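Ticket opened by: R.M.
Priority: normal
Category: complex prediction / small molecule

The reporter submitted a protein together with XV6 and asked that the result be attached to this ticket for the collaborator who will pick it up next week. Submitted input follows.
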Amino acid sequence: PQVTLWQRPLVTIKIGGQLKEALLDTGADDTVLEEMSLPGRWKPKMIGGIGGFIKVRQYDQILIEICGHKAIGTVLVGPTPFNVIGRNLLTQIGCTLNF
Amino acid sequence: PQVTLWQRPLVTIKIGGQLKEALLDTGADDTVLEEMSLPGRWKPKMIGGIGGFIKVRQYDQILIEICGHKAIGTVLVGPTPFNVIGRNLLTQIGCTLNF
Ligand SMILES: O=C(Nc1nccs1)c1cccc(CN2C(=O)N(Cc3cccc(C(=O)Nc4nccs4)c3)[C@H](Cc3ccccc3)[C@H](O)[C@@H](O)[C@H]2Cc2ccccc2)c1
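Result attached by the on-call engineer:
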């Protein structure tokens, strides 16, 4: 799709059998999701944002379908205000920025 | 131009006679820059990000050049780690997201 930026660029994702919506976020290196039951192993990590750092759990090799596109990668789950999809998954669905 | 997201999408901007680099950030509503000196009047605002909230100063009607394109808008100056251009300016240079 081509999405213009007059509104939040929100998309539907299915992760773990749950459907959420999320923001396509070009400035975020990593994908961070709000608290959610994911099965499996995870490693604690911290990321920074504006505002500070947050401790998060990192899940590797998780399948996500973002607007119907499947991709697999790392997601971080933690106290974000909003589900953000960052460049690690954006490259996989082929997402580009044009001006 | 077209920008793929394998690297952080930085552009050069010129603002208040100064050159900086900034990140193009579709997940950000507002543009927020590191502290620098801008002329004029401002007012306090408080912005939330991942990690928390920060207080910033709002300058309205600032001229920025982002790549070779000019825009005039609100700019927030404050304690970010990284200069972020948000959708309020991104819309003015006609930036789209495509997948
Ligand atoms: O990978 C990451 N970090 C890592 N650390 C180590 C390794 S990887 C990472 C992953 C996701 C997000 C971020 C951190 N992050 C944010 O904090 N903001 C808040 C933001 C930025 C700019 C403006 C606003 C804004 O307008 N906010 C408003 N609040 C009220 C009104 S408007 C908000 C949003 C996301 C957001 C929007 C709304 C609510 C909550 C969050 C941006 O869209 C993101 O790209 C990014 C920008 C950034 C990148 C690096 C360092 C600092 C800041 C970093």
